[PDB]
């Protein structure tokens, strides 16, 4: 009835098909930084936003790892008193600032290599209290 | 799948009636901190989370003001390899840290006065770069 | 009896006078654990509330009665100028830490938000250099 | 029914007679610090406390100046769940920390010079927000 | 014609009569700041100065305590090349900055309660090395 | 009767004879630091003390300059509740800390070239408020 | 006879053909960071190294920008007294440490998008004095 | 080794193996460095000195001269063109070391060679530091 | 042999050259304990005195010979110009701390004030980065 | 020049003026110091390097060599005896200059010379700072 989180996967063939190439690149580029850091807490993310929801879905399905986990496609609120064109967003959660920076670079690399991909705005995010993403 | 953002409000007549009481309380309680301070950028939020999406949807509909704006009901990722019970969440965006604390306090106040309402966990949130929430 | 006396304490919710009781109930729930006394703490904080209606202040005094949050009686600020002008009544709500003090302040703000007939009180956190005699033996 | 603030004075003769010696000494001792200065906000006080309401009342009536102004005799709450003997208090409001320390010293001087006067405890007090003791405007 | 220091007392009966009222006020007002703190060094004072040596003398005789001890009535030198009206001074020696300040306060108090009394100018004084006033 | 301050003098002929030698030395050694400086307040001194009042009187009489001015011979209070043997002192006022150190050194120099004469203990002194010694 | 630097080039057609894909990617991923900053000194680089000189040549030819400039394919010294197999290296010169890190990521990303590319070791480099790369 | 690409200087055991025209410079350095020229096994290869200028032969002799246990020159290389066209080349040689102090002695040593041989070119230079160690270890 | 020698050391006032002995006696008393060696400190300070009269400087040099305060011989500062101009003599008085160095300056200033025939010497405190070899061989 | 006292080294304007046994050292320093060897006319004389050792003749060549517009050695002087008895003399030469950078370069120049010449004495030295400027302008 309501939004639902991306379903997780260990095997690359579980990743939806059209996000698969983005997923693979992310796995190779993130490397060890993609792995759950047992030590740290989940107090970081990167928020990506732009106008195309389908682009963001792929990004959300591509960013699913031990230490890097995206939520579903969401929205920013309308900016003004009235309705305007929607800005969608995905939060890519992770454990430390450095991983969060690498997530940003990762997507920017994907964009660089795919001129037809949306150029997403982004920001590093930090949470005062830890999020419940432990196993 | 694809969410839309809560509709904004002209008059309280435009707030969904199930959230109207929560909304009116927040309007009075936030007072001036609920008004848009164009002097500021949008670099803060509060994230509320819990297991009950209806609770969160009323919260979301309730927090719709000039300087305090909720996103729709959303989700955190599954924490592990397999699927666990869903943790829903709502981000309430605002323009400064003081307001983000007032937002947490508003919700605690509502909860105190309504022992049946869900006791939501939350966290203050800070963004490095400002969000596109300025008025056109 | 020419002098003020301190508010009486409660052994149960129903000992709070009825007109102030709902406000007291909301405070008990909202303050929660922080309403409780911390016998390892000293008393060097308060929130002063002030306004024009002494009966409103009396209910706020009656409502703020807990182990770690205790209102004095309805009192007054001095006149600001050379002649008697409208009275600003005030109540001090004594607390054990700054945190609880801001919570006290928020509690009343919530109360007012949820009850429009309630007076819109002004307030300020207050800090004492020395500990007040509010400890037990 | 409700407490009232001390009446403010235009001339020494308007001061209640029993408090008038204390008022004159404070007027002379405080000197310039007893006057209002328009450069400052009302964010300080001295709280005096003891078991003697009449002694406090003279103190309260004595400290009525442009820049130093006492509240009425009030009470601190009971320390415990049971009533205990009343501790009375007076807040003497000032515009700055130095004036607040001078007020404590003033009263210590008064005690030193009058062995029959009670020995009051006190604390300096700081308010995060300014109190409404300025004139309208 | 050499100056001598004022006489010390043990009893209040030992204070010269004309200085006794001021002495008893100071004894009461200074309280325990008035008494000697043996683990402390004498590196402070209050200098009082004005035009009336008689008022200063009583002040001198008044401030005689374990931790607060006045020297005799003395003088500032002349301010200019020629002789001008004499400015008398008395140093009241203390062991800390707090007591100094209280000494200033003590005498202001005395002045507020006696309009006839001289309104003496004063300064806190600090000595880099300790004075020989330990017993 | 009460103490008076040393008589100021500008010509070395107006200096009391017993102190002329000291004075001539201090005049040359203090050099420019002996001169008054209007852009400075009078918030410093050196206090000299010891058991011999005549020694201190010469010093008092010697240190009379534009920017360096001694009070008369005075005393410190007795250290205890019984009368002790007197410690005398003289304050030499001046405008800055540097000059006060110079004044100290000047007297040590004098002690060094007159080894038979008595030694004085000293301390640099600082006043919170400026003393009334401008013209 | 002596080594020569890579050809600089304005438009992509002047880029050697084999380096053009890597150059385009870099041009897009570096973004503004690829541009010169005349108010910045050349005191950074990334040194890339590996055993395939042809791989290094393409990287060398690809990193030719206003603010990011590669030297030619060079060598590290033999590490021992005997000749062993050669470790080639290319220095990619930059005007700040952030650009350096970005150059490093740019190649990692290239390696993540082409599993056939060699996997170059690399290091940020810091120069005490500025190199003569000013316009 | 690949014929289309630079090779590193041949390393050498006795002084006689140094290329004839480098040898004096080499002997001079060997004396000036003393024991600083030896492999310091407690240290990682994280430093160099870069020498640069416009005469490649001058740099080639320096390159050939600086081959010791703990200081190893790469071959004559180049900086990239500073601008949009080919312009006069600046050649360079990196002389690798294990620590800052050895890197300063290399720099000093060359300064000495120049002050004592006025035909030698006056090479610009800089200390260089690497975040990760280079593969110059045993 | 034919180079400058330091002042001959003497720890008995009568062994001080007679012409410097009054200046010596005054310095010994005025420096007091500051005049003694403190093994705990190192020799990283001095006062340089200079002037055009080498004899006045010679007496100063002879006068300042103490355990913790020790003058070198009368020396010179270089010619300022490309050509020779009238000589500026100097004496370094070595000390173990800054306080003692200022005292040394005050000492000579005192001597000048009490002896108007004495030259007025300019001086400067001096600080050395590294310790001079003035510790006792032990 | 009073014959009882030291005098400053003779200044040059041309290298044939340099005492022959110091000429090698002199030229080497002129080249090593380069620009830093000349008078920096926006600066006062408040630095030096003191060199010391037991061989006065080596120090004398050093004194003679360090003569430039911005680096100027005094004569061979010495330190005081360290103890209350005559012991072996430690000779010293101050090499004056206008800023701390020049003084570090002076120090390095000598060091580079020594590293280059196994027969040269290994002189100890220290940088030196004067609180007031020395009269080396005129
Ligand atoms: Cl960001
Ligand atoms: Cl975890
Ligand atoms: Cl939080
Ligand atoms: Cl109320
Ligand atoms: Cl009440
Ligand atoms: Cl209501
Ligand atoms: Cl407040
Ligand atoms: Cl009244
Ligand atoms: Cl009383
Ligand atoms: Cl207090
Ligand atoms: Cl003062
Ligand atoms: Cl004497
Ligand atoms: Cl002192
Ligand atoms: Cl003046
Ligand atoms: Cl690195
Ligand atoms: Cl540039
Ligand atoms: Cl060459
Ligand atoms: Cl460098
Ligand atoms: Cl002679
Ligand atoms: Cl010795
Ligand atoms: Cl003489
Ligand atoms: Cl100096
Ligand atoms: Cl050094």
Author numbering:
A (entry chain C), E (entry chain G), F (entry chain H), G (entry chain B): 1013 to 1147
B (entry chain D): 1013 to 1148
C (entry chain E): 1012 to 1148
D (entry chain F): 1013 to 1149
H (entry chain A), J (entry chain J): 1010 to 1147
I (entry chain I): 1012 to 1149
In the authors' words:
To characterize the structural properties of LANADBD, we crystallized a construct encompassing residues 1011–1153 and determined its X-ray crystal structure at 2.05 Å resolution. A comparison with the DBD of EBNA1 shows that the two proteins share the same general fold (RMSD of Cα atoms = 5.1 Å) despite sharing very little amino acid sequence homology. A central, anti-parallel beta-sheet forms a hydrophobic core through which two proteins subunits form a dimer. Three helices, which contain the key residues involved in DNA binding, flank this core region. Remarkably, the crystal structure of LANADBD reveals a higher-ordered assembly comprised of five dimers interacting end-to-end, forming a decameric ring with an exterior diameter of 110 Å and an interior diameter of 50 Å. The dimers are arranged such that the DNA binding surface faces the exterior of the decameric ring. The interface between the dimers is small and hydrophobic, consisting of residues Phe1037, Phe1041, Met1117, Ala1121, and Ala1124, and buries a total solvent excluded surface area of 963 Å2. In our DNA-free structure of LANADBD the N-terminal portion of this construct lies across the DNA binding face, based on homology with the EBNA1 co-crystal structure. The surface opposite to the DNA binding face of LANADBD is a dense basic patch composed mostly of lysine residues. Consistent with this, the angle between dimers in the decameric ring is approximately 110°.
